[PDB]
Amino acid sequence: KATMIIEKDFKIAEIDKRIYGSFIEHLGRAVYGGIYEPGHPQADENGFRQDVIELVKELQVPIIRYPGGNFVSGYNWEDGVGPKEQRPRRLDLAWKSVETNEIGLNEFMDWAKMVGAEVNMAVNLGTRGIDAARNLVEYCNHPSGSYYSDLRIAHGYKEPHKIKTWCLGNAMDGPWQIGHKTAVEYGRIACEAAKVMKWVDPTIELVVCGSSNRNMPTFAEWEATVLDHTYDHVDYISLHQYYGNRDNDTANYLALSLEMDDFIRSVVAIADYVKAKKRSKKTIHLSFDEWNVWYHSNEADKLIEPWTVAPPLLEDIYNFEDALLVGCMLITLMKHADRVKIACLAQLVNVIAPIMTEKNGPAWKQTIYYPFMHASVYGRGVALHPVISSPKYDSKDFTDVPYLESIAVYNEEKEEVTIFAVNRDMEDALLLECDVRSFEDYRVIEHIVLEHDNVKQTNSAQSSPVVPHRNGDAQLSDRKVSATLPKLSWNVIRLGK
Amino acid sequence: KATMIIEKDFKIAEIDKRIYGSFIEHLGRAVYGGIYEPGHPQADENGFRQDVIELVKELQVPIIRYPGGNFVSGYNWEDGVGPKEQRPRRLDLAWKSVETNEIGLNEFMDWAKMVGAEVNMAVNLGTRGIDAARNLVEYCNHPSGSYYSDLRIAHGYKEPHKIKTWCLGNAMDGPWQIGHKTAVEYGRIACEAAKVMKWVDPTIELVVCGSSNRNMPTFAEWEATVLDHTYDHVDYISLHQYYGNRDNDTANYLALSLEMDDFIRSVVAIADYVKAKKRSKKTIHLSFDEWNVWYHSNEADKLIEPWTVAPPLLEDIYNFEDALLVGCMLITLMKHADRVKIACLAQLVNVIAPIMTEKNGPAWKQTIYYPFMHASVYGRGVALHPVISSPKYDSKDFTDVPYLESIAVYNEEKEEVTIFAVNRDMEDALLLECDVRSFEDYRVIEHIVLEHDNVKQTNSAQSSPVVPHRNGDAQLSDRKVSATLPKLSWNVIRLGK
Amino acid sequence: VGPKEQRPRRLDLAWKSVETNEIGLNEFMDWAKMVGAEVNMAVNLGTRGIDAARNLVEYCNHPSGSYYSDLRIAHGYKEPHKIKTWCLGNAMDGPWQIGHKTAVEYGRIACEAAKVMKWVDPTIELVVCGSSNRNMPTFAEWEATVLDHTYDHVDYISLHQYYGNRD
Ligand SMILES: O=[N+]([O-])c1ccc(O[C@@H]2O[C@@H](CO)[C@H](O)[C@H]2O)cc1
Ligand SMILES: O=[N+]([O-])c1ccc(O[C@@H]2O[C@@H](CO)[C@H](O)[C@H]2O)cc1
C-alpha cells in the first residue's frame, strides 16, 4: 500500500516542454537510413522517410539537439552546406566513419520543420573556436546583407533559421574526445565563443557543457570551473547519463533513477555555488541533453570495420525493464522541473533510439517509445510536489528505494491532472491511494498500463508484445483516487472534467 | 488578507534544538560583569550572577559557543586554567583589552552547567595549531592517565568535561583577524587539527569555519576551498550574519531575512558541490554560529581607550523593529531545519545581547529577548513546509517581499502546533487564514503578540514598554484558524489537541 | 630524556596507546650499543619542525658548551652519541599520518630542517621521506617534488613496501 497527496497549491514548477526533447547525431544510421533514405518507397520529395516523420510527430518532441555529440568536435559546418558536388568526404574520427556530408545543417532544418521540432544547434569547440562559432550563428540567424547571411540565402534558404538555443561544443572532458580541453581551457573558449555568438544575435541562449559522465575523475570540479569562466554569458549547464543492466539485477537497475536525482541535485548545487561566488541575480538551469539506457549493443559495435558509410552503430534493442527505467527517469526529470528546463533522449532514430528502421523496410517502436510518448503527450502543465508514503527496499547500491515512483502534473488550460507512476515491486501489486480533495469535480478518464511478464522481452519489426493497454482500474470516490499498480508496471492515470 | 496551509504531512525536518543556541566571548562585559561578578548581591558561591542564570534558563538555550570569536585566535588556553596566581595578564589584540584570565575554560564549564547548556568549544588556529588542539581535547575529554588529563584532575575537575562539538578556529578570512589565513592555509591546518582532535576522542564533531561575512571578496570561494580540504574530517560549516538599520528604512530592514534565506541556500549548495566532488555519502550541515542585529553601539565603542579590563563594548540597546527582524531570522532558521542544525545568537549577555546587566545592579531583558524565548520554548518539533499566499511589497534592495513571514512547527509528543508569524506591514493589519484540516480536534490555546507603536522604542533597566501580551484574536471555525496580525507585529499562535 | 619522574605520560595518536616514555632516546642508544648497531634517528616533522630538529642534533652530537649538549651530559651521557644518519620525519603523504603534509609542504620543511641539522653537525647524512606506499595516488609525483625541494641538502630518498598473501 502507498499513499500520495495531490495538492494543486503544493507545486514544483511549470514543466518546460523542452524536457521532452531528443537528439540526432551524425552517428551510424541516425541520419543515413534513419531520417533520410532517398531509395525508400516511403521517402518524400527531399528523401526523408515519411514513416519516421510520423513516428517522431506522435512523440511531440519539441526540440532536437544536432549534430553532436562527439561528431561535432571534429566537424566543419561549411562542409555540409551549398551544392552537393562541392561538399567534401571527410573522416569522422569520433565514430571512425566516412561522412559524405550529403546531409548538412540546412537539410536537417528542413527535416526538423517536418516533425515540428526546433533545433538545439551545437558548435565545434574541439578543432575550431570563436570565429567559426560567430560565423555559424550569422549564417543561420542574421537576415541578410552580410557575407554569411547572403550565403545562406544563395544556398536556397531565404529566411533565417532563427535558432534559439545553442550548445557550446560537446563534452570535452572526455579523453576520447576530439580536441579535449581541460575545464579551464574549455571554460575560456566557451566564454569567448558565447560572447561573439550573442553579439551576432542577442536573442539566443547558450548551453555550456558539463562532464561527459558523473564517473569522470573531474566530475563536479569541471562544472564549477566551467561556470566560473562562463556564468555571465550562458543560460544552462548540461548533464549526461546513460544506464545499463550489465549484471542482470532488475531491483538495483530500477533504483538507478535515485542516482539521477542526486546527480541533478549536485549540478544544481554547483550552479548555485557559482551564482553566489559571482553575486549574480541570474539563475542557471540544467539541460539534461543526453539521457537513455545504453548497453545492449556494446559487443556488436566492436566488430565494425572503420571507414564505412553509415555503419550500424549503437543499435540497442530495448526490453520491458528498460522501458520501466526510462519511465522512472522521466518522472525524475518532471520532479526537477524547477531547474531542468531542457532534456534530450539520446538518440531519436536507430542510435540508442525509441524508433528503429530497416533499409527499404519498416520503422517500428521500441519498448521505450511508450513511456516517452506518454510523458510528452500527457506531461504538459505544472509538476506538483509528491508527498508520498511508500514501502521501500534495499538493493546492492541503494537503500530505502521506494516501490512507488510517481508525480502528478496539472494542466489548468485542459483541466486535466495526470498521475505517472511506476511500481518497482517485482512480485506484488501496489495499492495506491491519492488524496485529490484539492481538485473539485474531477473524474478518471482512463488508466493506461505498460506491463509484461518477461522483463527481457523486446519489440521488433515483426511483432510488438510490449505495448500499452487501457484496462487499469483507477477509480475516483469521495475525493480519493484508488488504483492497483501491477507488479513491474508503468501507469498513466488521467483525470479530467 | 493572507492564507497559509498547515499540512501535517508536508514536512521540512525535525528541528535540532541547537538552532536555539548562543555564544559568549571574552569580549567587553560578557564574562566580567555579565555572567561573573564576585560580590554582586546575587552572586553565588563561584561568583556567578544568579539573576543572569535565571534569565538564560528561561531562554532554554541548549548550547553556547565559547570563548570566541576573534578573541580565540590569539588566546592560549593554558593561561586560563590552574591556580589564579600563575595565570598571566595578556593583551587581547582582538578587542584591545587586558585579559586577566580570572575566568578560563573550567570556570566557564561550571557556569554552563548552571544554565543547563553544553559548550561548543573553539580552538585557536590563529597563533596556534594542531598540537594545542589535540592537547586541549585531551585536557577536556580524556578521563585520566596522561599528562593533560591528570592536569585537569589536579586543577579540580575529576570527571572530564566531555565536550561534543568543537569549532576549528574562528573565521580568519578577515584581514582584521589575528593569524589570518587564506582558504588553502586554513583548510590545511583545520584538516590536520580535526584529525588529531578526533584521534584523541572519536566521539566529537567538528565545525569548520566559513567566511566572516557574506560580503567578503572571498565569499563562497572560501567555503568551497575549505570544504575541499576538510570534508572527510568535519561535520558542519559555519556561517555568520549581522544586520543593522543604518539608513532608517524599516520596510527594507525587515526584508533582510530574505537575504539570510538566500545566504543559507548558497552555503548548502557549496556543501553539496563538495560532497559530489568527493563522492562522499556524508552530508555536511550548517552551523549559523553568529547571528544578530549589531549596529547601535558602533560610534560609542570608538571612544573607548585601549588596554582596559572589561570595557563596555558592543552594548547595543535594541528597539522594537530589531525584535521583529530577529523574529524573521528565527523563522528563517526554522525554514532551513533540514540543513541548519546549530545556530548561535551572538551574544548572550551584555555584548550584542538579549540580556543586559548593571554593575551591582539589575539584569534586564532587551526587546529581542522575547521572540528568541518564544522560538526556543515553543519551536521544538517538526518544521512544516509553509504554503502561503501573501500580499507583497518592493523596497530599495528587495522585490516581492511578503508582508507575512511565517512557519508552523508541529510537536507530536506535546500534541501542539505553533504558528510563528510576523506582519511586516507598516500601516495595515493582516487577516491570516490557516487551513488546519490535517489537525483534527486541535483548538486555539493562545495568541501571543509583541507590538509597539514606536519601532524605535527600547527597553531599559528602569522600564520595559516593549513586552508581549496575550490579546491576540486567533480563533478556530470550520477547520480554519483566522487571526488578525496587527501592523508591525510578532505573533505566536499556539494550537493543541 | 632526563629523570623519569619528570617524563610525562602521552597519548600516542599513531597507535592509540599511552606512551609512558620510560624508554627514550638515551636508553635506546644504550641498547643499540649492546647489539653493536648504529642508530638511524628520525626527527618529528609532523607536529614539530626545524627548531626541534636542530636542537635534537645538538643534544645528541655536539660535544659540550651549549645548553642542549650540556643537558645530555647532565642526563648522564658525557660523550656525544655521534649519530651519522638521520631521517627527516616519517612518510606523511598518508592521510593517516599525524601532521600530514603535501609534497610541497614536506619538501619545504625537510629542506629547512636538513640545513639546520647539517649546520649543527656537517658530518651527518640525511634521508628524505618517500611515499608511504607505491599505491598512493601521489606516488612518484611525491618523490619528484620532494627531491626538487631538498636535493642539495640530502643524501638518500626512502621507499617502503609491505606484502601479504590475502587471497
Ligand atoms: O559513459 N560512456 O562510456 C560514455 C561514452 C561515450 C559518451 O559519448 C556521448 O554519447 C554519444 C552518443 O549519444 C555522444 O556522441 C557523446 O556525447 C558518453 C559516455
Ligand atoms: O561584518 N562585520 O563588520 C563584522 C565585524 C566583526 C565580525 O567579527 C565577529 O563578531 C564578533 C562578535 O560577535 C566575533 O568576535 C567575530 O567572530 C564579523 C563581521
E strands present in chain C: 10-12, 17-19, 41-43, 85-88, 125-128, 156-157
B425-460: string of b/e by CB count within 10 Å (b at 16+)?
beeeebebebbbebbeebebeebbbbbbeebeebbe
Same fold across B1-15+380-497 and B16-379: no
Contact A376, A409 (CB under 8 A): no
Residue B405 β-bridge partners:
B422
Place of cell 491532472: A417
B304: CA distance to ligand 2 center in Å? 18
Place of cell 573558449: A189
Contact C94, C138 (CB under 8 A): no
Closest by Cα among B51, B205, B45, B168 to B110: B45
Longest dimension (CA), chain C: 59
Inter-axis angle of helices B369-378 and B50-59, nearest 10: 50
Single-letter amino acid code for the residue at A297: S
Residue B237 and residue B323: Cα distance in Å, rounded?
A: 27
Place of cell 543499435: A315
Q: What is the dihedral of CA C69, C74, C77, C81, to 10 degrees?
A: -20
Report the helix count and the strand count for chain A, using DSSP H and E: 11, 25
Which one of the ligands is nearest to A170 CA?
Answer: 1
Closest by Cα among A308, A310, A301 to A32: A310
B169 CA: distance to closest CA in chain C (Å): 17
The answer for residues whose C-beta is within 8 angstroms of residue B143's C-beta and 6 or more apart is B149, B160
Bond into A462 cis (ω within 30): no
Helix (H, G, I), strand (E, B) or coil at B220: coil
Residue B195 and residue B125: Cα distance in Å, rounded?
A: 14
Is A277's Cβ below 8 Å from some Cβ in B? Answer: yes
Q: Could you give phi then psi for residue B470, rounded to 5 degrees?
A: -115, 30
- Residue A207: its H or E element: strand A205-208
Residue B23, C-alpha cell as written in the block: 555564544
Helix (H, G, I), strand (E, B) or coil at A375: helix
Fold of B1-15+380-497: Immunoglobulin-like (2.60.40)
Single-letter amino acid code for the residue at A265: R
User: Where do the structural domains in chain B lie, given as residue ranges?
Assistant: 1-15+380-497, 16-379
Single-letter amino acid code for the residue at A3: T
Helix (H, G, I), strand (E, B) or coil at B442: coil
CB atoms within 10 A of CB C151: 12
CB atoms within 10 A of CB A52: 27
Task: Tell me B89's DSSP state.
Answer: P
Is A147's Cβ below 8 Å from some Cβ in B? Answer: no
Residue C125 β-bridge partners:
C85
Residue A449 and residue C133: Cα distance in Å, rounded?
A: 57
Residue B83 and residue B3: Cα distance in Å, rounded?
A: 62
Single-letter amino acid code for the residue at A211: S
Q: Could you give phi then psi for residue A236, rounded to 5 degrees?
A: -140, 155
Residue A227 β-bridge partners:
none
Q: Give me the half-sphere count of Cα atoms (radius 13 Å) on the Cβ side of residue B158.
A: 0
What is the chain C residue with the closest CA to B185?
Answer: C105
Residue A215 and residue A219: Cα distance in Å, rounded?
A: 7
Touching status, chains B and C (3+ beta-carbon pairs under 8 Å):
yes
Q: Supply the Cα-derived Rg of chain C in whole angstroms.
A: 17
A192 backbone φψ class: left, alpha, beta (φ>0; ψ -120 to 50): alpha
Helices (H), A28-182: 50-59, 105-115, 130-141, 147-154
**Resolution given for this structure, in angstroms:** 1.2
Is C5's Cβ below 8 Å from some Cβ in B? Answer: no
Residue A97 β-bridge partners:
A92, A308
The answer for residues whose C-beta is within 8 angstroms of residue B80's C-beta and 6 or more apart is B87, B101, B103, B104, B105, B106
Task: Tell me A305's DSSP state.
Answer: P
Contact B376, B7 (CB under 8 A): no
Report the helix count and the strand count for chain B, using DSSP H and E: 11, 25
Q: Could you give phi then psi for residue B318, rounded to 5 degrees?
A: -80, 150
Experimental method: X-ray
Angle at B212 between CA B211 and CA B214, to 5 degrees: 70
Closest by Cα among B466, B486, B489 to B254: B489
Helix (H, G, I), strand (E, B) or coil at A393: strand
Residue A349 β-bridge partners:
A355
Residue B196 and residue C12: Cα distance in Å, rounded?
A: 10
Task: Tell me B175's DSSP state.
Answer: T
The answer for residues whose C-beta is within 8 angstroms of residue A48's C-beta and 6 or more apart is A35, A36, A110, A111, A114
CB atoms within 10 A of CB B40: 21
Touching status, chains C and A (3+ beta-carbon pairs under 8 Å):
no
Q: Which residues of B touch C9 (CB under 8 A)?
A: 145-147, 150
Residue B463, C-alpha cell as written in the block: 522600564
Give the B:C interface size as CB pairs under 8 Å.
Answer: 34
Helix (H, G, I), strand (E, B) or coil at B170: coil
Bond into A67 cis (ω within 30): yes
Contact B417, B439 (CB under 8 A): yes
A26: CA distance to ligand 1 center in Å? 13
Chains that touch C (3 or more CB pairs under 8 A): B
Residue A124 and residue A181: Cα distance in Å, rounded?
A: 12
Mutation target vs C (from B141, B147, B198, B280; most C CBs, 10 A cutoff): B147
Q: Could you give phi then psi for residue A377, rounded to 5 degrees?
A: -75, -40
The answer for residues whose C-beta is within 8 angstroms of residue A445's C-beta and 6 or more apart is A416, A494, A495, A496
Cβ-nearest to B145 among C16, C18, C99: C18
Residue B49 and residue B363: Cα distance in Å, rounded?
A: 9
Cα-Cα-Cα-Cα dihedral sign, residues B368, B374, B380, B381 = negative
Is A259's Cβ below 8 Å from some Cβ in B? Answer: no
DSSP codes joined into one string, B4-72: EE--TTSEEEEPPGGGGEEE--SSTTSTBTTTB-TTSTTB-TTSBBHHHHHHHHHHT--EEEES-SGGG
CB atoms within 10 A of CB B302: 7
Contact A491, A468 (CB under 8 A): no
Residue B293, C-alpha cell as written in the block: 542585529
**Residues, chain A, total?**
497
Task: Tell me A350's DSSP state.
Answer: S
Task: Tell me C136's DSSP state.
Answer: S
Contact A495, A447 (CB under 8 A): no
Residue B19, C-alpha cell as written in the block: 538552532
Residue A257, C-alpha cell as written in the block: 533513477
Residue B226 and residue B72: Cα distance in Å, rounded?
A: 19
**Residues, chain C, total?**
167
Helices (H), A142-218: 147-154, 183-200
Residue A367 and residue A468: Cα distance in Å, rounded?
A: 10
A355: CA distance to ligand 1 center in Å? 19
Task: Tell me B79's DSSP state.
Answer: G
Any idea which architecture B16-379 has in CATH? Answer: Alpha-Beta Barrel (3.20)
C8:B147 CB<8 A: yes
The answer for residues whose C-beta is within 8 angstroms of residue C84's C-beta and 6 or more apart is C38, C123, C124, C125
Q: Is A25 in the pocket of ligand 1 (CB under 6 A)?
A: yes
DSSP codes joined into one string, B291-341: EEE--TTHHHHTTPPTTBSS--TT----BHHHHHHHHHHHHHHHHTTTTEE
Q: Supply the Cα-derived Rg of chain A in whole angstroms.
A: 23
Cα-Cα-Cα-Cα dihedral sign, residues B320, B322, B324, B330 = negative
Cα-Cα-Cα-Cα dihedral sign, residues B266, B272, B278, B281 = positive
Q: Is A70 in the pocket of ligand 1 (CB under 6 A)?
A: yes
Contact A68, A26 (CB under 8 A): yes
B62-100: string of b/e by CB count within 10 Å (b at 16+)?
bbbbbbbbbbbbbbebbbbbbeeeebeebebbbbebebb
Cα-Cα-Cα-Cα dihedral sign, residues A134, A139, A144, A148 = positive
Task: Tell me A127's DSSP state.
Answer: S
DSSP codes joined into one string, B456-485: T-B--SS------BS----EEETTEEEEEE
DSSP codes joined into one string, B352-421: S-SEEE-TTS-EEE-TTHHHHHHHHHH--SEEEPPEEE--EE--SS-SSEESEEEEEEEETTTTEEEEEE
